[PDB]
Design a protein around this ligand. Structure first.
Ligand SMILES: Cn1ncc2c(C(=O)N[C@@H](CC(=O)O)c3ccc(Br)cc3)ccnc21
Length: 164
């Protein structure tokens, strides 16, 4: 049910799209969230996904942290996808604006390999401060399962395709 994507490799696809609108249309098995270790979904992709769930994602996430403590940078957890997907895979890429090790970006993408197909954003891009061209290259070189990347910004999408 994914449509309109540009094929980059055997398993990686990309589209200029709002991941919330894409998730509402497709209702994928897995949507990836660009999470932080606390699962505090304030801004960026996480703020947008949480708002689309009417804050249900944040209420579930606060219970998960109260029980388990914070995630690791490069780690993940599977929670409900609420009205957006069957599941949400919350993945923590390194935040350059907080000074985190960019080498953890490959470990972050390795979480995607536990799922046959995913709808996802580029990790560590946007307000996380990493170069999105670098993030797409690590994604291509690490993920082996089928990943459908939604890039919100039209100008960034064009730059990512042209420089691939
Ligand atoms: C309504 N809302 N607010 C943010 C956001 C995001 C979001 O932060 N995406 C990131 C990642 C991406 O989409 O490639 C991003 C956005 C813009 C630039 Br420029 C660079 C990275 C995605 C969906 N809905 C969103």
């Amino acid at each position: 049910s994914f449509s309109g994507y540009l094929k980059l490799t055997d398993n990686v696809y990309i589209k200029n799209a709002d991941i919330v609108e894409e998730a509402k249309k497709v209702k994928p098995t897995v949507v990836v969230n660009a999470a932080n270790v606390y699962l505090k979904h304030g801004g960026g992709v996480a703020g947008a996904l949480n708002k689309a769930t009417n804050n249900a994602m944040q209420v579930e996430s606060d219970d998960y942290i109260a029980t388990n403590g914070p995630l690791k940078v490069g780690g993940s957890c599977v929670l409900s996808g609420h009205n957006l997907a069957k599941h949400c895979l919350h993945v923590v890429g390194p935040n350059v604006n907080k000074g985190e090790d960019i080498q953890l970006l490959k470990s972050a993408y390795e979480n995607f390999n536990q799922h046959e197909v995913l709808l996802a954003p580029l990790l560590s891009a946007g307000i996380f401060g990493a170069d999105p061209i670098h993030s797409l290259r690590v994604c291509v070189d690490t993920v082996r399962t089928n990943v459908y990347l939604a890039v919100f910004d039209k100008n960034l999408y064009d730059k990512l395709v042209s420089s691939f």
